[PDB]
Design a protein around this nucleic acid. Structure first.
Ligand SMILES: [Mn+2]
Ligand SMILES: [Mn+2]
Ligand SMILES: [Mn+2]
Ligand SMILES: [Mn+2]
Lengths: 373, 373
RNA sequence: AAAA
């Protein structure tokens, strides 16, 4: 038997348990059992598994044990804890009461309070960790978690590249130098990307010689701006080799530049964020349900930020696009992540219509529009 | 001399406090003092205001009092309670520890436990209320809240219109008799409703005679089915009078029939639902942000149900429509309401594509499709 | 902060 046991209560929010266990283990540096006190409801949602997989401890140090209580029955939980610590003698007992129902938390606290060789902790959301007993004091959780740990703790599998077509020195100026004065030309390329033929050919080939393509395909686009001459012209404004155009170059022009700009700006200028915890164009998946997130990052307070980028949302069409994006962003973050997340919408346009502003305010979506970017 | 005082802890979920207070006031039916223990964070979110407005007790029965604690400081809540209750002579101190942080709840329990004039309660979500002290007892919270009380507890105003164009006997067969064989005709009327003129004329008036409209108004819709002859036909298949067409007759054909079917099915066949707590064609509003909800109801266990109706989601367009509807429904219910809500999508179509099925399952959206309707 |  190990000399130390870490007692945690399992509930919907896995992060307070992952954060505490990782912090305590790396302070303590000793073999231990981690006891997860769970329920039938939480085991159906695999919460104990998500906790274990986020921590990925080796078998040399850590033993796991999951026991089950009725989360709403204070006597059954008191009895289970009482019998457990009669049957198993530990020299150091560490209890995190942050998780569970209030019934589970109350039973644990009332059982462990004032006992010898016992320490009791509670983590308020967004604050320093507290020791409640035996010595009241606070501990800073600064930089404890990584982005991967946060996603693992939610049972979310993911894939990202952080591949950028242009570097930060270029994207810092691409709006002024290439985008702002060529908006009409860009609408053509947007049409080009959504055109039938061009989309299908890029499923089979990696690049395309734009000079070698027939003008019938450019007129089949149906757009005033989308001529063979203009597409060659805007491709060269952005520095691409018109003889070897791959799809990501088109996507860069049609709005990928703003995703890269936001991603690199965070990596280079946001003081409460480390580069290493920032991700661009992430695919997340859970229960075979897939979503694409433009930019996400974990800040140094271990809080997740999720950004949807919309380069421009001007017009009657841009307002419908913006409205749809507010719902989609809100649904994803409320459904895939726990409490400790902030959602943002970034755009170059200036948002002044009452409907998106009031919706974002009600939703808690932080809007960062042209006035600040 | 209030011989009874209720004490409640204020947190994000207002329903457990509103439900408990209404239940207890209805049980004892004597004047009482009601103490709210709140925090600066919850007052910023107006949570005690929502609780009191939902209950709208008369000054002649209830004295509301409010004291303030730190949500994360166990000794602060103990001290706040100690000072307020010192030397008290209440006959009955009724303590609801369901709300607050675990720190608040714990502090409250430890303060009131084992006292001679206290009773301590905890409400597990979706279960029987529990008395914890001095006896272990359970109570059913059946039919405690009204739909209006639930929405007031969230600070939400709403309007609705329960008038149905057709009765339940007609709506039980309208799909087979009128819809299934005229989908293309109805697609014409769907195009009619979106047309700028037809939408405009009905904003400046109420009644339109369809015989006196020029054909050029219909050809201007640009739908192969939206002729003058075809629309008159479908208006007659549903049994209306072409001289006096209201926007509601049109809305009935374009999908209102299915909303009415769902609404009437709830009122006529859902045994755990009181018809007075069901609402059709709802507009909810908070912070000047409005949402249209097809059908909502509070069931007899005080749980809110929110329904989006989509008559048909067949085809490429239908799946994009259905996808947008899932995000919109999820965004609204996760943002506007607390934990105690269930969201549903009702459709006549059969949903079997993997993407919507897995999205709905991850979101917890209950799909009632044609296999059940 | 009805299962940070
Ligand atoms: Mn985007
Ligand atoms: Mn004092
Ligand atoms: Mn029943
Ligand atoms: Mn609908």
């Amino acid at each position: 038997m190990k000399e130390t046991i870490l007692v945690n209560l399992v509930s919907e929010q896995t992060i307070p348990n992952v954060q505490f266990i990782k912090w305590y283990f790396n302070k303590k540096q000793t073999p231990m059992k981690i006891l997860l006190v769970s329920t039938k409801e939480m085991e159906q949602k695999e919460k104990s598994l998500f906790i274990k997989n986020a921590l990925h401890f080796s078998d040399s140090f850590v033993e796991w044990e999951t026991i089950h209580t009725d989360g709403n029955d204070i006597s059954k939980t008191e009895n289970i804890l009482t019998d457990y610590f009669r049957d198993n003698e530990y020299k150091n007992i560490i209890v995190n009461i942050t998780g569970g129902t209030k019934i589970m938390s109350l039973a644990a606290f009332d059982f462990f309070n004032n006992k010898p060789n016992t320490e009791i902790f509670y983590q308020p959301i967004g604050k320093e960790l507290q020791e409640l007993y035996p010595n009241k004091q606070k501990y800073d959780m600064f930089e404890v978690l990584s982005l991967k740990e946060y996603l693992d703790a939610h049972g979310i599998s993911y894939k990202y590249d952080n591949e950028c077509v242009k570097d930060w020195n270029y994207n810092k100026t691409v709006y002024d130098l290439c985008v702002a004065d060529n908006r009409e030309l860009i609408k053509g390329m947007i049409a080009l990307q959504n055109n039938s033929y061009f989309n299908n050919v890029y499923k089979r080939k990696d690049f395309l010689d734009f000079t070698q393509i027939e003008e019938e395909k450019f007129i089949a686009i149906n757009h005033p701006a989308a001529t063979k001459e203009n597409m060659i012209k805007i491709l060269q404004i952005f520095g691409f080799d018109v003889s070897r155009i791959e799809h990501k170059h088109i996507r860069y022009i049609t709005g990928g530049w703003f995703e890269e700009y936001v991603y690199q700006k965070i990596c280079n200028e946001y003081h409460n964020v480390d580069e290493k915890n920032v991700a661009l164009n992430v695919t997340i998946q859970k229960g075979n349900d897939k979503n694409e997130l433009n930019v996400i990052y974990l800040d140094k307070d271990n809080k997740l930020h999720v950004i949807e980028c919309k380069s421009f949302v001007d017009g009657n069409e841009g307002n419908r696009v913006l409205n749809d994006a507010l719902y989609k962003l809100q649904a994803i973050i409320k459904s895939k992540f726990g409490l400790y997340v902030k959602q943002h919408l970034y755009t170059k346009s200036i948002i002044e219509k009452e409907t998106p502003l009031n919706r974002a305010k009600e939703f808690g979506i932080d809007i960062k529009d042209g006035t600040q970017l």
